[PDB]
Design a protein around this nucleic acid. Structure first.
Ligand code: S96
Ligand code: MG
Length: 856
DNA sequence: AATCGAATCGCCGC
RNA sequence: UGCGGCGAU
DNA sequence: TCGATT
């Protein structure tokens, strides 16, 4: 209940410690040392305040058991509670005579749930309610017990399949009362169908709700010493009451843990000196010896991190330190614009003045509810980014530490960082610029065209777009508030940043010093990498790996292929037929028309199929999506928005149209990018064979335990895949739910997306070192697929990102290297089942050097 | 037989 | 952890 | 749709 302040004797260490001060004062001076270490002192200070504010509000709301400081307390006490409730059940059954009142109520709820609801509600009542009476907390236990018994029978009983239809809207409800009002209208709806056996709940009375709680409190006192019984004015019939007090030893446990956790989570701020170079696993980035040291790899387990101690990966270490050394500064010009517009609009860009009815009304209401929370969540992120940009505005330069995820993608550590949204990217620019020159001016206009959404057109048409709109750009630069043209663009704040740089070149000529980050973003890198490994000519051209006519739109190509089979099916497709299907719950066979492919093609041609229908399906292919996943997508992306808007009259049966759409998209994407589909199948089959435990059926004994998946990337960064699952988990309807084996399903669902994400991270890192050593590039803007630098270095980074990818896949067969990692661990019975390596195609990688639109 | 499930990271909230 | 929402890729 | 889990 009362937590020590860490800052008084412990946060003072990081400012006074001589070794962190000296090692950083040696590099950059004593005065910057006191500023940087005070900034990190503030970083832990605001983080401590975040934990205390959350804990105080959780204490008031009764959600203290949901806080992480109470969690290890719950883990130890609660096995004792389930055994004590299970032992008392057998005691009463052995005893003759009438049962206690609480006995019949207790059996309706699962034994481990009885354990939970008592502890949390006793914690909730002892930390917030100000009433320590036994009677008041027993009724709170029993009322929450009657909740899980009455509405948990929907989840447990013959509605479990139907509960899978009501669970997500229950999860979308925020607050226990809102989750309650939804469960009441659900329960009445199901009773109208006889789904609960027609048995309506008889509400427990107030005397019954106390008896379940009283038996539950004293059963916690028998099992655990958490909670202690006291009597006041005993022997007086008018004033005899019993109170309940939380045990002091358990109070100090959560208080020490809450204090320990508060010093462990700091709010990461940018660095006013260049960040600490990484020499090992830990201690990089920020300079102080803090309570939470930065890890080079963000891992879930410490053991997965300590696997990185011995690996010699010098090129990985060099690339992270080069990215850290990139000097950034706040764009003051766009900050002046952003500081005034956000006062007037909740979102600066959202609203600019410019020239089944039962179910559809619920869906419209759910959109307004989702839009309302989306608005408040979007705004609070904006106010933090603006206050960070205002805080570091006056500094001549700021820096961002970098580390990596377990796949090797590199991320900035500060909460305000250049891998953020458009406004945050707009507020940030590089600090060390050079005179722009003719070539830099060319790429500055190309970057300006990309910010406007003119990325689908060749480079000369991008230049002509800028020069045609020359007067609009200078009008926006001179007065951004008077001309809202820049805000109507695809990347508005980043476009406004281009406008200021474009105006300065017009004012100061080609000698103008420009430090804007000019971003080159790969089109679809997962397919781009996959087509490079297996030499896919057709797939590579679709993702602009080949020098092409125009920019190749893979979404348009798939939509074009879809429209080919659509027109073929409208002529020679199947006719409609009548099929019989039954709901399992209703148990009644009904006859409905199954539309043939000729009718479904006519529906889709009437709607008009463009790249928008095929867009989301192509992106999710690298994440493992297939035909079934596309059906949900095209229903919610295209069919349902059409239906609500007055269109969708062609989609008489929307699920049959969506499934037909999903089949056509999958047939189109599989023949467009064949190496992508083939490679993710081969990786999935590999993780399949390793993640199985191989037992002979007769002996029932393992011949090969469950095996993780490990590969090393061309950079030299090792990566293991170690998806593990807990054995037991427990979930309540109105209350929050709270070694181990390998999750075989997660190993396959993740192997292909993580392998290709590990491939782009190496390519990003190898690009960074190649651009820094072969060319003179010192400033890098990196977002996974995006490569940014100053305009004077833009042409060289254009070459370096191509040169690294050609040099990588000409030197390494990463799939063959992947095979040599796991071939020894394969069981002998699994060897015949393994698919062979996919066949290499006729693609020449040297054409990537001549490809304009790969960008990567 | 019956059933189940169709990428990573960060912030905020419960 | 889980769930809700936001953002990045 | 589609094979793997349970
Ligand atoms: O609209 P078009 O311009 O015509 O076509 P696209 O340029 O291809 O798409 P767009 O919407 O404009 O945003 C593209 C820009 O944001 C990045 N980006 C946006 N969304 C994603 C996603 C997914 C979102 C939902 C499921 S997965 C996954 C990886 N990267 C993404 C892109 O990496 C690019 O940088
Ligand atoms: Mg776009």
């Amino acid at each position: 209940m009362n937590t020590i302040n860490i800052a008084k004797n412990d946060f003072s260490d990081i400012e006074l410690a001589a070794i962190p001060f000296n090692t950083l004062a040696d590099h950059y001076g004593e005065r910057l040392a006191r500023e940087q270490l005070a900034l990190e002192h503030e970083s832990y200070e605001m983080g401590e305040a975040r934990f205390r504010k959350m804990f105080e509000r959780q204490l008031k709301a009764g959600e203290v058991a949901d806080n992480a400081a109470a969690k290890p307390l719950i883990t130890t006490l609660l096995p004792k509670m389930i055994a004590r409730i299970n032992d008392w059940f057998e005691e009463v059954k052995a005893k003759r005579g009438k049962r206690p009142t609480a006995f019949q109520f207790l059996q309706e709820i699962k034994p481990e749930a009885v354990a939970y609801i008592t502890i949390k509600t006793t914690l909730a009542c002892l930390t917030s309610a100000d009433n320590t009476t036994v009677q008041a907390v027993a009724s709170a236990i029993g009322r929450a017990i009657e909740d899980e018994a009455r509405f948990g029978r929907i989840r447990d009983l013959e509605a479990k399949h139907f509960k899978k239809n009501v669970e997500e809207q229950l999860n979308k409800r925020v607050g226990h009362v809102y989750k309650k009002a939804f469960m009441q209208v659900v329960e009445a709806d199901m009773l109208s169908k006889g789904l609960l056996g027609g048995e309506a709940w008889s509400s427990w009375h107030k005397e019954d709700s106390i008896h379940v709680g009283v038996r539950c409190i004293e059963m916690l006192i028998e099992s655990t010493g958490m909670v202690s019984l006291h009597r006041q004015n005993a022997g007086v019939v008018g004033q005899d009451s019993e109170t309940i007090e939380l045990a002091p030893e358990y109070a100090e446990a959560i208080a020490t843990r809450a204090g320990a956790l508060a010093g462990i989570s700091p709010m990461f701020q940018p660095c006013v000196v260049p960040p600490k170079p990484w020499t090992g696993i830990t201690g990089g980035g920020y300079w102080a010896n803090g309570r939470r040291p930065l890890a080079l790899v963000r891992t879930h387990s410490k053991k997965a991190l300590m696997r990185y101690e011995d690996v010699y990966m010098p090129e990985v270490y060099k690339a992270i330190n080069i990215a850290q050394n990139t000097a950034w500064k706040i764009n003051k010009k766009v900050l002046a614009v952003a500081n005034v517009i956000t006062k007037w609009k909740h979102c600066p860009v959202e609203d600019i003045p410019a020239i089944e009815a039962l179910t559809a009304w619920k869906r419209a209401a759910a959109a307004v509810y989702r839009k309302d929370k989306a608005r408040k969540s979007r705004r609070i992120s904006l106010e933090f980014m603006l206050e960070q940009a205002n805080k570091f505005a006056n500094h001549k330069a700021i820096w961002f530490p970098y580390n990596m995820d377990w796949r090797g993608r590199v991320y900035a550590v500060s909460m305000f960082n250049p891998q953020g949204n458009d406004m945050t990217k707009g507020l940030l620019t590089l600090a060390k610029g050079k005179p722009i020159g003719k070539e830099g001016y060319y790429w500055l206009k190309i970057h300006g065209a990309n910010c406007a959404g003119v990325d689908k057109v060749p480079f000369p048409e991008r230049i002509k777009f800028i020069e045609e709109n020359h007067e609009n750009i200078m009008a926006c630069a001179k007065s951004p508030l008077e001309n809202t043209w820049w805000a109507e663009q695809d990347s508005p704040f980043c476009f406004l940043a281009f406008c200021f740089e474009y105006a300065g070149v017009q004012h100061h000529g080609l000698s103008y010093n420009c430090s804007l980050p000019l971003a080159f973003d790969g089109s679809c890198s997962g397919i781009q990498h996959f087509s490079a490994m297996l030499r896919d000519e057709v797939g590579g051209r679709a993702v602009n790996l080949l020098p092409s006519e125009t920019v190749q739109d893979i979404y348009g190509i798939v939509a074009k292929k879809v429209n080919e089979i659509l027109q073929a099916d409208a002529i020679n497709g199947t006719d409609n037929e009548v099929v019989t299907v039954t709901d399992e719950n209703t148990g009644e066979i009904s006859e409905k028309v199954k539309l043939g492919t000729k009718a479904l093609a006519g529906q889709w041609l009437a709607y008009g199929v463009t790249r928008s229908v095929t867009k989301r399906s192509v992106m999710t292919l690298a994440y493992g999506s297939k035909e079934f996943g596309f059906r949900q997508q095209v229903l919610e992306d295209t069919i349902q928005p059409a239906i609500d808007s007055g269109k969708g009259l062609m989609f008489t049966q929307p699920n049959q149209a969506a499934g037909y759409m999903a089949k056509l998209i999958w047939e189109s994407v599989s023949v467009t990018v064949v190496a992508a589909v083939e490679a993710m199948n081969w990786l999935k089959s590999a993780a399949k064979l390793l993640a199985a435990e191989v037992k002979d059926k007769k002996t029932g004994e393992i011949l090969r335990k469950r095996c993780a998946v490990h590969w090393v990337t061309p950079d030299g960064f090792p990566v293991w895949q170690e998806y593990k699952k807990p054995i037991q988990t427990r979930l309540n309807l109105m209350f929050l739910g709270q070694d181990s084996e390998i999750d075989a399903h997660k190993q396959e669902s993740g192997i292909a997306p993580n392998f290709v994400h590990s491939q782009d991270g190496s390519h990003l890192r190898k690009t960074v070192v190649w651009a820094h050593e072969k060319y003179g590039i010192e400033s890098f803007a990196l977002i996974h697929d995006s490569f940014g630098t100053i305009p004077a270095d833009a042409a060289n980074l254009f070459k370096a990102v191509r040169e690294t990818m050609v040099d990588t896949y000409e030197s390494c067969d990463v799939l063959a290297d992947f095979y040599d990692q796991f071939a020894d661990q394969l069981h002998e019975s699994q060897l015949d089942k393994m698919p062979a390596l996919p066949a290499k195609g006729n693609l020449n990688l040297r054409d990537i050097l001549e490809s304009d639109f790969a960008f990567a």
